[PDB]
Amino acid sequence: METHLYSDLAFEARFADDEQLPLHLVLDQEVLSNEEAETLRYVYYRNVDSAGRSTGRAPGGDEDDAPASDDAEDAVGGDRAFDRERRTWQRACFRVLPRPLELLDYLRQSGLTVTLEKEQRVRMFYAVFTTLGLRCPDNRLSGAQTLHLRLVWPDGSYRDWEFLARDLLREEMEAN
Amino acid sequence: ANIFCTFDHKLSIADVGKLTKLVAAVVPIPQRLHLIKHYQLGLHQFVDHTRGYVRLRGLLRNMTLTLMRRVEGNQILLHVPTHGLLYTVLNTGPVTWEKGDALCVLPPLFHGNLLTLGQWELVLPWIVPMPLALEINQRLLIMGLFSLDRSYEEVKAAVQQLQTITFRDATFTIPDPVIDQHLLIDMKTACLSMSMVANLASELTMTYVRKLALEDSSMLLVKCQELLMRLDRERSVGEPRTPARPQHVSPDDEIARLSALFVMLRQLDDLIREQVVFTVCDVSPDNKSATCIFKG
Amino acid sequence: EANIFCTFDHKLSIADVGKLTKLVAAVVPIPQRLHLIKHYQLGLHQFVDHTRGYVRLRGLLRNMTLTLMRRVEGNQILLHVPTHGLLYTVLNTGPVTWEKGDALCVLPPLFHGPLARENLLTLGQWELVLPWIVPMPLALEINQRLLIMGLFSLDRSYEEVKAAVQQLQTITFRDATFTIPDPVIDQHLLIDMKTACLSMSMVANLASELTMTYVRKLALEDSSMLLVKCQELLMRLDRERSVGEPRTPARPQHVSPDDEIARLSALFVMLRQLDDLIREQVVFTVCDVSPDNKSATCIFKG
Amino acid sequence: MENWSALELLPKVGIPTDFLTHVKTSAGEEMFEALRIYYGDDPERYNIH
Amino acid sequence: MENWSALELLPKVGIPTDFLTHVKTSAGEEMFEALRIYYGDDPERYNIH
Amino acid sequence: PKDMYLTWEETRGRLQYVYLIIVYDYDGPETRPGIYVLTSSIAHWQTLVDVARGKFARERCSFVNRRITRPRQIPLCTGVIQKLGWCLADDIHTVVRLDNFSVELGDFREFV
Amino acid sequence: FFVPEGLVEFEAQPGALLIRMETGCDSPRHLYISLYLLGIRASNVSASTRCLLESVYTASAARAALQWLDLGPHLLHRRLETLGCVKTVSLGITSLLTCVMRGYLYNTLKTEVFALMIPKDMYLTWEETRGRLQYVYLIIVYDYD
Amino acid sequence: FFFPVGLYLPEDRGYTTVESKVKLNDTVRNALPTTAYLLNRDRAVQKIDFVDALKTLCHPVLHEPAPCLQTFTERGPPSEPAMQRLLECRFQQEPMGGAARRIPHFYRVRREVPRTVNEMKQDFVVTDFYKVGNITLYTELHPFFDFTHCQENSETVALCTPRIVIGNLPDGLAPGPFHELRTWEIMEHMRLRPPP
Amino acid sequence: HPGFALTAVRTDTFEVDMLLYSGKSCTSVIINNPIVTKEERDISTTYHVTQNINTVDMGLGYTSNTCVAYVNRVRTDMGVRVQDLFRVFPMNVYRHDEVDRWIRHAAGVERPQLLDTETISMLTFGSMSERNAAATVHGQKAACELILTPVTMDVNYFKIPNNPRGRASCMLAVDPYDTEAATKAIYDHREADAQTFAATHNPWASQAGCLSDVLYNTRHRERLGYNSKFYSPCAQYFNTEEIIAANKTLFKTIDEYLLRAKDCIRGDTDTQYVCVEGTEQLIENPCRLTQEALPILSTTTLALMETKLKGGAGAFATSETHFGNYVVGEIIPLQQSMLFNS
Amino acid sequence: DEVARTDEWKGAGVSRLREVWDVQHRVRLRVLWYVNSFWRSRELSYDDHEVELYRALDAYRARIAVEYVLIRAVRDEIYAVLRRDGGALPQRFACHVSRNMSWRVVWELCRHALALWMDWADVRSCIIKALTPRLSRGAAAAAQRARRQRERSAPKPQELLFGPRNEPAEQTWYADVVRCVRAQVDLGVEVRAARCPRTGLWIVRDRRGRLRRWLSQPEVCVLYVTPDLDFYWVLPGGFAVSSRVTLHGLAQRALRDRFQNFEAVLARGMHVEAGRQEPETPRVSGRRLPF
């Protein structure tokens, strides 16, 4: 719970350099296993734009459109392709609660006041509270953007889930 | 341990009568040497025009204090006090003492009855209660901060208000740190250091709460970040849009920031802390000497 | 209570008792403060465990009480816990230059650089390693560099942190050079970073509108060496923030000096709180050193 | 490493030891093989094993 | 570690030894602390330095 | 006194040092300072302050909350440690009082 | 026999094999190498022991014998000639050895029986029950891979 | 000192050597042991049951086989080449919608599956199972779980599965007649020892 | 009855007057003059007078012997109060809260408590968590158990002195200083077992990774979070590395038995904690030398215990067996004629 | 009262909980919507024309399809070199063989296994997993240094007689094992491999050194890839066909977007020293009290 407020205020204070918008999430047994959620090191997100590459590169053109050409020496470009690939990810905050709970009764056990339209009392065995950012380039925002959720365990392996921006804001953007 | 302090000069018996009034006073010595001359006695080994105050308080941290015990005609028995046992010292400084007060030691800038020789003089540090010591310490430090802008007159009224000091039977004139529209050099480094520490405290926590809340993030970090947002919003309210801090910083500039923050924090310990020396016990009548425990 | 007896388990050779009898008036850290102890509880080798963290040894060594070694007679060494304010003598085993008038601290054994591995005591599966009796400025520099290595290394790849830490681990003190062996990120180190971050933000809030701009005023006024050497740092800061010009300061609007005195008082409170996290307590203040720097005497407890 | 306590407690032959340089100079600049200089008064001579 | 040559050269006393078990068994099962069991005639006791 | 006494221990350390600790809880409108007498097996000051910070972080967040909710009012401190001495683990007596007590009137050492 | 200083490491202990190796030159044309210095040529030797004992022969003449073993058109045993076992050194800059041709190995006055040393990698037995006697043989077996 | 409680003697080897002395009414509560009577420091009949062992039986470390799994997987497959026959499993995952027509398509091969391990723990009788003739004794580690070594993506990986009921214990460790007597005890508990 | 059968062990400490035999001048005791040391107090003046003693053995073999002769009382209660695992592992809780609360209401343990830090455990010696009870009518107590199979053949595993581990883990049968053969004798299972020629007797108790093995090897307890102060009676049978370290020639094993392999139980506390290198008393344990536990008189039903008590002397020696009931008899009549003998 | 944003944040509460799926409909994660976020007070506009969704689906199609077009390139290369040599393949892997044996049926089983492997390709396979070390950080200087050390001249006696001592005969190979007795395909397989010194062929063992024993089984077929992207496809009997995997018909940033190998930063419990033996994981778990 406690990470959502902090990330809200952080994206508020960092809004003029990048116009990211907060995206407070919860993950549960439908996503990753409890053995995976007990050793989950950190998360990773990336605001890939609507039509093209990503946010962490030049808008028009780069030196990564070229073929790899199957060489041994600079197999994929060299180190600069590694730097471009490392720069485009941003680290979101992270908080995992590895005990079974109910979300609404948890938030009422904290100070918040959930007023849901009908009792969708969701139950889960472990709740990891994550909070991504999604970009608006101008103050408007296209629905054709997508996200890339990257979950990292300390062995080096990862998993990737992707979803668009349209389904995220299908009703809540239409509620404002 | 005993120290024998002799004089190479001729000692007049009138000056013996002056010196026996200093039957037991605090004097500092730069190094615990058994037989010593009188040129290392007192604070006359550090007096000049240019150093001033903070140099003496820095050099008083590493000096060892001692008490005069008896007077021979050409040597003085100095007696280094030890912790826990108690001794009778004399109230040298202008403030009078009360029972229970923790006594601290300070260089006598205002001082103005001393041993007099041809080139050597005797000067003894003020034995002041600790709250007055911290009080005049922060008074002198704020008076050093105001030293650049005294061309205006309400700030002249401010430093005139800061000039006097309220205590029991006490109206002292703390001397002006800025002389001839210029500051003495160690106070200049001190005020500059606390100024730049106050600057980097603003300019680095905005990065480091982000760097630290990727761990377990309690509500301490959340209210800290909101307080930082309040500072940023009240800072740049009369300014253009935002300072707009970046995320991808060069490493070595951050190292040069943080090491500078700590190394200039290092040279402010003499001003933020106080060596307590004596905890006083039952005082003599009219408060000119007192039995005190040496808490060193 | 003042004297404690440690007895050995192994038989002692002539080489063993000869190595021990050179260790008279040396420092020994004992955790337990019991009247009688075995040699497994002696010194520091019961907690020496590499790939764990130098801050762990710095934390637990801070809690262990000290003693001096005298009257060794075989199967007993008769350690003597010193009390406060009396005059005792200390032989430094670690190759640290000692100067008079100086105050000492206790640090875990950081290696000299050749890695001599002079255990200076032989058992079958036990060694007598010793903490380093170190002067105060070196220990202060160690704590400072440790906290800098702690704060910098968050969220960094191995490349830049390697190229910085290989510079940062190297220390110098009076024609010597030491390194920090196990600088890893630990829990106590982490909570010390959080307290340092809270304290630094409190210094940020509790600065008035004139102490913040004093360096700007002097940057208009004077040009010394350290004026430039601080102005470059603040200029690079304000240029990485904004691409404008660093503004000249203004006139002080609200002057009401009790607010400034209380403001500096709260600043002093938070700054002493920040300063105590790098300063260790003085465990020995010297009186006079040998000219060989092999021993000295000290007026403090353990 | 020899037992310097054995040198201390055994009775010695009095010799007019008069070498050229200063004693500390000839010691600290390594003229002899194995040196052992205690500056105070070491009690290691009083422990017999 | 143990000067076993001094045992073979210095004149001993003559004692009636009564080991509990057989003496080679008590040697091979290491009741005692330091052993120098061998066979034949070692000339080790002759090269005195 | 049974009310002011507390510990975070099984009190099976041999040399039980004692510590006066007060705090400043700003959940009340003015202040609700919880005065406390605290024994501990731990003797060093700084690591004890770190354990107390681990135990009293709610008062720290209340302290920062007072700082944000009222800028003109200065927050004084957060708490002050002062040791008094040390005893033995059998010298306690359940009002809990001590039969022997070595004294050491230490200093007011603040902490946040 | 004389020997340069570059080969007398692992030789201050008495008792070790000594084989003179051939050399197609004229002046140093015969050279007396120990068995352990031949250990950097055997494929039987594992990597750990080889990296140990090659890290003691980092002098001038040891690598010259290493090159001279691997430079001719012939095999090893057409260039190796056994001399037997040493019993004393002399330890100069040109050390003098005393090899034992036939008979036992002992000190002067026979006060100490020297022992033949062979490294563990070259050792090889083909029976679990050794007899009252067992002879020793030196086996060179070539891998024509 | 040590003593057992609640064991199960076999029925086909049952006997009585105290006939003239004791005579117990033939209810099931006397026909199945659940107590143990010892003597105190005084000559006094104390009694221990399963009820008083609740400070041990219900601990959360007893149900966590993760250090057990780690110790079981560090010593991996049995290096004996004579027993390369039991560590064969193919535990795949496929969709279920096409299965109803793939079930005559599964037997379009004429090659058998190897025998599973939990099948191999059931063809031993009550008394040889502790002998070395059993192969699967390195699989039985814990009365709450099933440990095995068999293959995923052509690599022998250790697999620990929980025995959700008590039926998954092997018959050598938990025979059928014991279950029948246990049910008889349950029927006596519900006042049903003559059933309708 | 659930689908298994637990079997308990316990350690029971008696009070022994052992007699000592020694030949004429077995040792030589060298003394010297007393040495004084002066300690100055404010009022008193306490002198510690000292005198050092060297004892030299004047024998080749064991020149002096002892024997255990007479008991007079039993210090422990010899009860069946089951060992509280929730206090020796105060950290391991159930994941869901309500089932954990319901188990804590089911058993007697009230709440889990946090284990101490590393530095606190450096300063203090141990936990000593559990409370002394009010009325301790029979003495101190211990009873710890192992989950066993209900098909364990009782006639050879509960009637003779047997190692309750599953195998005969006697290290002395192993040829000394051989580490591979030791794990081949106590851990492997594709071979026979000593003293009972099956592979094992309990597959949940013998090999590595049993709940006994993960619960009573002390290294497996350090791998999780355990409590150090409590004494485990099982721990002498499952600390494997201590037994491998006890693999010497048998004279050295006897020397370590009379020198280092004696245990500590504090006599004042109500449970059985361990001494913290205490010089008070070292408890001689002959079970650790042989790695065997002794069977105590256990009885399934009331009536078999009744006809045991009705019978005369030596009635405890037999082992009567009904259809589904059984009595294991004591291998030594120390319940027959110890407390009656007094 | 300058009342904090935290209290109005909590007392403002959360509007509604909305769940959402991913694009592949695999995971389903839930999103909260707090009212006191600054999301409301920025007055954002929002619109989605369908051509942008079409281009987004095409770009996501490329991001999913890069792996399978690499596998299709592999299959095309196999068939290309199999047509190119004319059907005659050598034995590159050591296995004893018999002469009187039916070999046309092994060709039929090889075609069957090839079609089966193309049916069951996945992103967790040989070429992808062997490609992940090639995309790493220090791969460029490592391959350059290995190329220079391979292409070094014959050493003169100077560097042999006074210079430093000189100096990977085994390889870390990746394998896809297919098998048609059960139609079981095994994807992520690691194989230790080196040369048989008695001959010139390859010996394939496990990391334990099992001497991997599927090559004698007449029904399996394996694909081998090497870290220098050498290619092998081995039918039973040790005969195999070799090539290079060609990725030059593919973009660069797609390959780094898809499965670029990860680089980690420092967290708690990690060595600030580079490369020592770390302690255990942080392991925030629910079995213990969380301390």
Residue numbers in the entry:
A (entry chain M): 1 to 176
B (entry chain I): 6 to 117, 123 to 306
C (entry chain h): 5 to 306
D (entry chain Z), E (entry chain B): 1 to 49
F (entry chain g): 168 to 261, 273 to 290
G (entry chain m): 50 to 194
H (entry chain a): 393 to 588
I (entry chain a): 1029 to 1370
Paper excerpt:
There are four major components of HCMV capsids: the major capsid protein (MCP), the triplex dimer (Tri2), the triplex monomer (Tri1), and the smallest capsid protein (SCP). In this study, we show that the portal of HCMV is composed of a 12-fold symmetric (C12) main body, a 5-fold symmetric (C5) 10-helix anchor, and a 6-fold symmetric (C6) turret, and is specifically adapted to pack its large genome.
The C1 reconstruction of one-CVSC-binding penton vertex, determined at 4.0 Å resolution, revealed a CVSC structure essentially identical with that in the portal vertex: both structures are heteropentamers of two pUL77, two pUL48, and one pUL93 molecules. Notably, the 13.6% CVSC occupancy of the peripenton registers in HCMV is significantly lower than that in HSV-1 (100%), KSHV (37.9%), and EBV (20.3%); albeit, HCMV contains the largest DNA genome. The helix domains of the two pUL77 molecules make contact with the two pUL48 C-terminal helices to form a four-helix bundle that sits above the front domain of the pUL93 molecule. For HCMV, the CVSC shows only one globular density located on the left side of the four-helix bundle. Instead of contacting with the penton, as observed in members of the α- and γ-herpesvirinae, the head domain of the pUL77 interacts only with the P2 hexon. Accompanying this Ta rotation, a curved loop region (residues 1143–1165) of the P6 MCP, which contacts the right side of Tri2B of the unrotated Ta, is transformed into an extended loop-helix-loop region, with the helix tip (residues 1145–1151) inserting into the cleft formed by the Tri1 third-wheel domain and the Tri2A clamp domain.
